[PDB]
């Protein structure tokens, strides 16, 4: 019953044909699926496994292992907040408090409209610009609530 929309299927086939061996494309495909849906739909794993010519068990294991993949919550924008040593020292808690005042959600939560999800992550390796956060692929230094609010207003 589950079918990948042609525009996604095409992008997926491109990754599968990119490396010398099909199975090497598993992570590029999973990033593509998550960017398309806003999560990894459990039903997408069987068609992907078939395309990669891998058992479903292998794909499920890979999805479970890699922390960037989320099989439970659909979110238009993922706010990855660094909770490691440098950002902690420089203001992770100020960033989280600002996010709560603006969006009304805490780490691991998704807004009622399914628009934003706060994801706590390890070191994003932009430590000199602590406290760091990402909004999907975009990465920023948190300065203040006023600055953060303006950044978030760009994601509609």
């Amino acid at each position: 019953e589950f079918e990948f929309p042609e525009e996604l299927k095409t992008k997926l086939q491109e990754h599968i044909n990119y490396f010398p061996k099909k199975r090497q494309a598993i992570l590029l495909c999973l990033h593509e699926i998550q960017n398309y849906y806003g999560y990894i739909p459990p039903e997408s794993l069987k068609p992907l496994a078939d395309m990669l010519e891998l058992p479903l068990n292998h794909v499920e294991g890979v999805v479970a292992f890699y922390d960037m993949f989320d099989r439970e919550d659909k979110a238009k924008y993922r706010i990855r907040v660094c909770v490691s040593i440098v950002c902690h020292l420089m203001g992770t808690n100020k960033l989280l408090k600002a996010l709560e005042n603006i969006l009304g959600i805490k780490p691991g939560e998704v807004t009622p409209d399914g628009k934003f999800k706060i994801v706590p992550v390890q070191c994003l390796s932009a430590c000199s610009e602590a406290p760091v956060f990402m909004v999907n692929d975009d990465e920023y230094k948190f300065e203040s609530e006023v600055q953060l609010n303006e950044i978030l207003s760009r994601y509609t």
Partner: protein, 416 residues
């Protein structure tokens, strides 16, 4: 158009690896060529692979990924074994406080691509990979575009510049695991599996990707290869101390006035990095400790050490996280424990349970909820993450924390 990247401050006294990357923007192939870019590759293709290995060896270049293995020697080990051989650029950079590699990838991708081509030619690899962490999406799109620019100017593809040497560079993405920076786990991930380190020996140089001889080198290591060929090994060896020669990137963060990446010789001291280059501390507060990534902890009495790979030197990757007098060391140690808890792959039992328990018990200690048994258990677990471990993570998960216990006992005793 690429995703937003924070503008990391970058400064150099050597004008080599940061010649262009001191400017926070993408330097495309035309600007790169205008600086004499790809001319070291042209010179390399006119030399034998054996000669390139000899120059890289004589340069004294050592791995910038943390283990410091001599690069030229690593190449000799791989070419001892029959082909096909594979070349891998390790762009997984995920250790807390480490942001040196990304500024090369994002601002001077061609310096890295040129290094990859020369290195691949040296080891006879016709297929190379860049494995870049999933949290570097901009770095990924910049490298894909730069690789295509190199293809169009004939630096990649078949019979590169009429040399008869073929090379394709594939860009692979990680997806959230620090362990995927471990060279055998990186290879497992590149093979389309979970990033689980392999039992060593065999080492990748003998049996790596698809069981074939594989050379894995860090971004910063590779970025030196064009300078070694352009300058020649002798001129390169003149930079900095003769025993730890060449430029080195220092990612500096925490309570400094000017956090960012510094390109400096390796005879620079830790105190010079902090005060002479990074502008001293925020609010001129006393330095309490320096965390060498998630690996070591140096006290305020240890700042006169050189930034080299000597035993008394700073070591690691040159990662400098500055903590001042107001920063709680126990609260800081908890953040390190939490890192290892989140990153153990779980294959080894003392690593799997030790990384979990060190963080769980340390949180109890921090929150004032630890019993005497939790305190004794914490000390035991911290000293016992390493047994039976098959990779470097288990061996170091308790290292920095043990050092805070030894160097800051007054602070820990306050939590008792």
């Amino acid at each position: 158009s690429y995703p937003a990247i924070p503008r990391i401050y970058a400064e150099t006294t050597l004008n080599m690896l940061l010649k262009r990357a001191k400017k926070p923007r993408v330097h495309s192939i035309d600007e790169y060529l205008k600086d004499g870019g790809y001319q070291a590759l042209e010179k390399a293709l006119n030399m034998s692979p054996e000669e390139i290995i000899d120059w890289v060896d004589k340069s004294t270049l050592r791995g910038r990924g943390g283990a410091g293995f001599p690069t030229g020697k690593k190449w000799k080990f791989a070419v001892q074994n029959p082909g096909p051989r594979y070349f891998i650029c390790n762009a997984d950079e995920s250790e807390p406080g480490t942001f040196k590699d990304r500024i090369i990838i994002e601002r001077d991708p061609h310096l890295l691509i040129e290094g990859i081509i020369i290195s691949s030619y040296a080891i006879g690899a016709n297929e190379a990979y860049i494995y870049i962490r999933g949290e570097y999406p901009a770095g990924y799109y910049i490298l894909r575009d730069a690789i295509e620019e190199a293809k169009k100017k004939g630096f990649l593809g078949k019979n590169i510049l009429g040399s008869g040497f073929d090379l394709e560079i594939y860009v692979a993405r990680g997806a959230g695991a620090y362990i995927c920076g471990e060279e055998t786990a990186l290879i497992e991930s590149l093979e389309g599996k979970r990033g689980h380190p392999r039992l060593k020996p065999p080492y990748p140089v003998q049996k790596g990707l698809w069981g074939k001889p594989t050379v894995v080198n860090n971004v910063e290591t590779i970025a030196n290869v064009p300078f070694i060929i352009s300058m020649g090994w002798e001129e390169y060896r003149y930079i900095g101390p003769s025993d730890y020669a060449g430029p080195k990137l220092f990612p500096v963060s925490g309570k400094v006035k000017k956090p960012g990446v510094y390109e400096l010789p390796m005879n620079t001291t830790l105190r010079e990095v902090i005060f002479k280059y990074a502008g001293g501390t925020l609010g001129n507060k006393k330095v309490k400790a320096v965390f060498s990534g998630a690996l070591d902890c140096f006290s305020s009495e240890e700042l006169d050490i050189p930034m080299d790979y000597s035993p008394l030197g700073f070591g690691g990757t040159g990662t400098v996280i500055v903590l001042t007098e107001e920063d709680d060391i126990v609260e800081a140690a908890l953040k390190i424990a939490e890192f290892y808890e989140h990153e153990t792959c779980g294959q080894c039992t003392p690593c799997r349970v030790g990384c979990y328990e060190q963080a769980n018990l340390l949180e109890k200690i921090y929150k004032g909820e630890a019993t005497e048994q939790d305190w004794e258990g914490f000390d035991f677990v911290n000293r016992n993450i390493q047994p039976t471990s098959i990779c470097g993570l288990g061996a170091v998960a308790g290292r920095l924390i043990r050092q805070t216990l030894e160097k800051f006992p007054e602070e820990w005793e306050k939590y008792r």
